[PDB]
Amino acid sequence: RRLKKRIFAAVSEGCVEELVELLVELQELCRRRHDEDVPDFLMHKLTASDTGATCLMKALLNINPNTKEIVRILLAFAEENDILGRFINAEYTEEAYEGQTALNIAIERRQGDIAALLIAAGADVNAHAKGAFFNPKYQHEGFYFGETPLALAACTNQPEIVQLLMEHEQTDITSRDSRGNNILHALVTVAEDFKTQNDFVKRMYDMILLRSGNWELETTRNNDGLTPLQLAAKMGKAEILKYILSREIKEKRLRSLSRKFTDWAYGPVSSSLYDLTNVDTTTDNSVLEITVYNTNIDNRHEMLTLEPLHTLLHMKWKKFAKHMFFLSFCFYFFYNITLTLVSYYRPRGWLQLLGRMFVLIWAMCISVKEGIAIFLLRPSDLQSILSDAWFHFVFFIQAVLVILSVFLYLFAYKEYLACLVLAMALGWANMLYYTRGFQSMGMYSVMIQKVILHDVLKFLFVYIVFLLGFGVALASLIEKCSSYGSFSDAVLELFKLTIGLGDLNIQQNSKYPILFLFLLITYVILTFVLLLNMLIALMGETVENVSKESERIWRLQRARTILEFEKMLPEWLRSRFRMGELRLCLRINEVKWTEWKTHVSF
Amino acid sequence: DGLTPLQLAAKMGKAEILKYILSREIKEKRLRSLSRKFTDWAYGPVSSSLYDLTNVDTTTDNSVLEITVYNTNIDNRHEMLTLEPLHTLLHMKWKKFAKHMFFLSFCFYFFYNITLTLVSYYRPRGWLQLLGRMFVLIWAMCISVKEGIAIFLLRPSDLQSILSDAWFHFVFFIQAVLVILSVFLYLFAYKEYLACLVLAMALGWANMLYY
Amino acid sequence: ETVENVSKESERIWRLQRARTILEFEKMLPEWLRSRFRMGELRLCLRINEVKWTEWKTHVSF
C-alpha cells in the first residue's frame, strides 16, 4: 500500500541509493513468508495494478543521466529472487498497448546499450505487441511498425540493433505478425514515396535482404495476399518499387536475389533481362494490374514510367490492343451511323428492318457488356475519382434507350421518338470517348469532365438561387390579362437574358414599371456581367491547371484501355506472353544518352 | 488595457511569440510550474500531451481565442488559428454543439424563405394565408431585433473597413424590415405593399449564399 | 486577376469565417448549457494527442 508507490517513484528519477535500500527493504518484506504465493506476491509488489507496467518500463520510459546501473541492479534483484523469467518479458495487461514489453521501449528510446543488456539477459524477441493501438484502422491513430523488435529497430533507423538482432540465434526473420506482415512489409508501410534526401528505408531493406540472403522474405503474402512488391505497388511508394523492380547485385552468392540481369553494355546502349514473376497479368493480382487500377494514390504516372512496366505496356499495345481499339471505334461508328440514318428517315418497309435489327443486336450486346461492367463496380472509390466510371453509365443509358425505343415502336405507342432521338444525341456525344487514342485529344476529352464536375456544377448551384429569386420577384408583380405571365415563362425569359438573347424592353403589363426595370437591370448586372465572367475566370483557371497535366492523364487512360482489352480476351489467344524461361525474364534494351554522358564527363 | 503578455501577443498579431508561449515545455524540476504543455506519453510519431487553458478559451470575457478570431488589424490570423490548443479547440467546439446549430439555423431560414415565396407568389391579385403570413411576421420580428442588437454592438468601425461579415448583418436587417413594412402596409389600405414584398423576397433568396 | 488572386487564398478565408461562426454561436448560448467546458483540473489542461509523421521521420533519419 505504501512500499509499492514508493518503489515506483524511486525507480523513476534515478536515486540509486534510495532504490537499492527500498529493494533490500522489499526483500525483508518478502522474507516474512505469508505462505500464499511466491511469484504473484512479487509481481504484485513490482508491477502496477492499473496499467500493468513493471518497474523496468518505468525505468526506461523516464530516461536520465543515471539510467543504466538502475536497470543493472534491478535485473540483479530480479536475478536474486528467481523471478526474471516472468519479469523481463512481462507485457501490458490493458488492451491499449497490449504486448509492449520492455525490449520495445528499450529499442524505441534510442537506448542501444540497454537493449543489448536486456537481450543478453534473456529477453524474448518473438514478442508481439498485438494491442489495438499498435494495429489501428488508419495511419493517423497509432504507430504501426509490425509489432516485432526487429521491425521496430528497422523502422526507427537503428541499424546497430538490427545487426545485433539478426546475428542472434533465436530471432526468426520471417516471423509474420498479426496482419500477416513480415519485416519487409513493415519497411514498405513505413517508407515515403517522394524522393526525400536521406531515405533510410531503402538502405535498411537492402541490408536486411542481403543479410538474410534468401528468397523467402520476398515472397510471403500477408492476410490480403500481397507480397512486398505488390504491397509497395498498392500503397503507391515509387522509390521502393523502383528499387525492387531493378535490383542488380553483382557478386556471386547474391545473384538469385537479383531481378534485372544486364546482358551487355556498350557506351549508352544496354540490353538487360528483367524478371516478370509478379509483374504481368499472368496471375490474378499483380503489379501492373495494381498500379494501373488504383484510385487511392496520386503518383500512378510516376510508377507507370519505369521498366518493365513501360515496355510491357508498349508491347501489349502494339501487339494486340491497337487493332482491338480501332476495331471497336469502327464498330461504334457504324452503329451510330445506322442509328442516325434510321432516326432521320422515320416513317412520319423492307429497307428499315435491315437497319433496325443491327441496331437492336449491337444495343443488346452493349447493354449486357455494360451490365457486367457495372456489376463489377463494387469498390465505390472508382465513382469518387474521374477515371472512367462515367462512360459505363452513358453507354448503358444509350443502349437501354435504343432497346426501349424499339420495343415501344413495335407496339402501338408513339412515344418512341423521344427515346430514339435522346438515344441518337447521346450516341453522337459519346464518340468523344474514342478521342483517347490520340495525344492532342485526350487533353480535350478530359477537360469537359473536369470543367463540368468542378466549375459548372458549382456556378449552376449558385446561379439557380438568383434565377429563382428574380423569377418569382418578377412574375408576381405582372398583372394577369406581358411576356412574364407565369413563373415558368419568367424563368425562361431570365435564362434568355443571361445568355445575351431576349428583350429588355420596358413595357410589360405591370403596375410598377420602375421597380420592374430596376429588378431587371439588377439581374443583368448580377449574372450577365458579374457571375458569368467570374465563372469564365474559374474555367480558365481549371483549363490552365489541367493542360499542364494532360500527358499523365492520357498515359493512364491508355494503360487502363490496354488492361481492359487484355481482360476481354479468352484463355486461348493469350499465347502472347512475354519470353521463355531463363522466371519469365523479358529482354529489353535501351539507350541512356543523358546518364552515359554525365557519367563519362566526370 | 487589461491584457496579459499572452493576450497582448495575440492582439498585436505576433505568431512566433504566441507559438512559443502556448507550447512551452521545460523539462527540469524547479521550472515546471512555468510550463504550459505537459507531454504525457510519446511513442514514435504518436504523442499525447496536456495543454493549459487559463487564458485561451471563452471562459473569461477577453481571451486568446476571442482575440485572435475577432481581429481585423492583422493579416496572419490563419497563421495563429492553426496551432494548438486553438485548432483542436475549434474542432471540438464545432463538432460538439455548433454544427447542429448552424444546420438548424439554415433549415429555419430555408423554411422562412419558402413560406415568403409561396405567400408572395399567390398574392390575392383568406384563412390559408393568415397561417403563412404570421410565421413570416414572427420570424421577421425575431430576425430584425437580432440584427438590431448585432449592429448596436457594431462600435469599433474597423469591422466595416474589412470584408469580415459586416455586410450580412445589414442585408438580413434590411430584408426583415422590408417584410414587416410590407405586412403593415398590407393590413392597411395601401397598395404599395407589393414593391416591399417582392424586394423582400428577392433579397431573401439572394441571402442564402451566406449559408 | 482578382479571382485568380483570391482562389489561391480561399482556404484561409473559409477557416476564418468558420471560426467566427463558431464563436458567434457560442456567445448565443445562455450561461446554462455551457456545461461543455473542456477538461477538469490538473488550470483546465485540455488533453490532445497527435501524430507528426513528417517531423518524426526527419528527426529519426538523421
From Swiss-Prot, chain A:
What the record says about family reads:
Belongs to the transient receptor (TC 1.A.4) family. TrpV subfamily. TRPV3 sub-subfamily.
Give intramembrane residue ranges.
483-508
Q: What's this protein's function?
A: Non-selective calcium permeant cation channel. It is activated by innocuous (warm) temperatures and shows an increased response at noxious temperatures greater than 39 degrees Celsius. Activation exhibits an outward rectification. The channel pore can dilate to provide permeability to larger cations. May associate with TRPV1 and may modulate its activity. Is a negative regulator of hair growth and cycling: TRPV3-coupled signaling suppresses keratinocyte proliferation in hair follicles and induces apoptosis and premature hair follicle regression (catagen).
Summarize where Na(+) binds, as residue positions: 500
- Catalyzed reaction equations: Ca(2+)(in) = Ca(2+)(out); Mg(2+)(in) = Mg(2+)(out); Na(+)(in) = Na(+)(out); K(+)(in) = K(+)(out)
- Annotated compartments: Cell membrane; Cytoplasm; Lysosome
Outcome of mutating residue 442 to C? In OLMS1; gain of function mutation; results in constitutive channel activation
Activity regulation, per record: Activated by cannabinoid that binds to the vanilloid binding pocket. Diphenylboronic anhydride induces pore dilation and enhances cation permeability by promoting the conversion to a homopentamer.
- What GO CC annotations are associated with the protein? cilium; cytoplasm; lysosome; plasma membrane; receptor complex
For molecular function, the Gene Ontology terms on record are: calcium channel activity; identical protein binding; metal ion binding; sodium channel activity
Disease link: Olmsted syndrome 1: An autosomal dominant, rare congenital disorder characterized by bilateral mutilating palmoplantar keratoderma and periorificial keratotic plaques with severe itching at all lesions. Diffuse alopecia, constriction of digits, and onychodystrophy have also been reported. Infections and squamous cell carcinomas can arise on the keratotic areas. The digital constriction may progress to autoamputation of fingers and toes. Palmoplantar keratoderma, non-epidermolytic, focal 2: A dermatological disorder characterized by non-epidermolytic, abnormal thickening of the skin on the palms and soles. Focal palmoplantar keratoderma consists of localized areas of hyperkeratosis located mainly on pressure points and sites of recurrent friction.
| ANK repeat residues | 1-32, 54-82, 98-127, 145-175, 182-214, 224-246, 282-304
Q: What is the lineage of its organism?
A: Eukaryota, Metazoa, Chordata, Craniata, Vertebrata
List the Cytoplasmic topological domains. 1-314, 378-388, 436-438
Designated name of the protein = Transient receptor potential cation channel subfamily V member 3
Locate the transmembrane regions by residue number.
315-344, 349-377, 389-409, 415-435, 439-477, 512-548
Q: What is its main location?
A: membrane
**Which species does this protein come from?**
Homo sapiens (Human)
UniProt keywords, alphabetically: ANK repeat, Calcium, Calcium channel, Calcium transport, Cell membrane, Cytoplasm, Disease variant, Ion channel, Ion transport, Lysosome, Membrane, Metal-binding, Palmoplantar keratoderma, Repeat, Sodium, Transmembrane, Transmembrane helix, Transport
Q: Subunit structure, briefly?
A: Homotetramer. May convert from a homotetramer to a homopentamer to allow pore dilation. Interacts with TRPV1; may form a heteromeric channel with TRPV1. Interacts with SNX11; this interaction promotes TRPV3 trafficking from the cell membrane to lysosome for degradation.
Q: In which tissues is it expressed?
A: Abundantly expressed in CNS. Widely expressed at low levels. Detected in dorsal root ganglion (at protein level). Expressed in the keratinocyte layers of the outer root sheath and, to lesser extent, to the matrix of the hair follicles (at protein level).
How does this chain sit within the bilayer?
Answer: Multi-pass membrane protein
Counting on the full-length protein, the chain here runs from 117 to 748 of 790
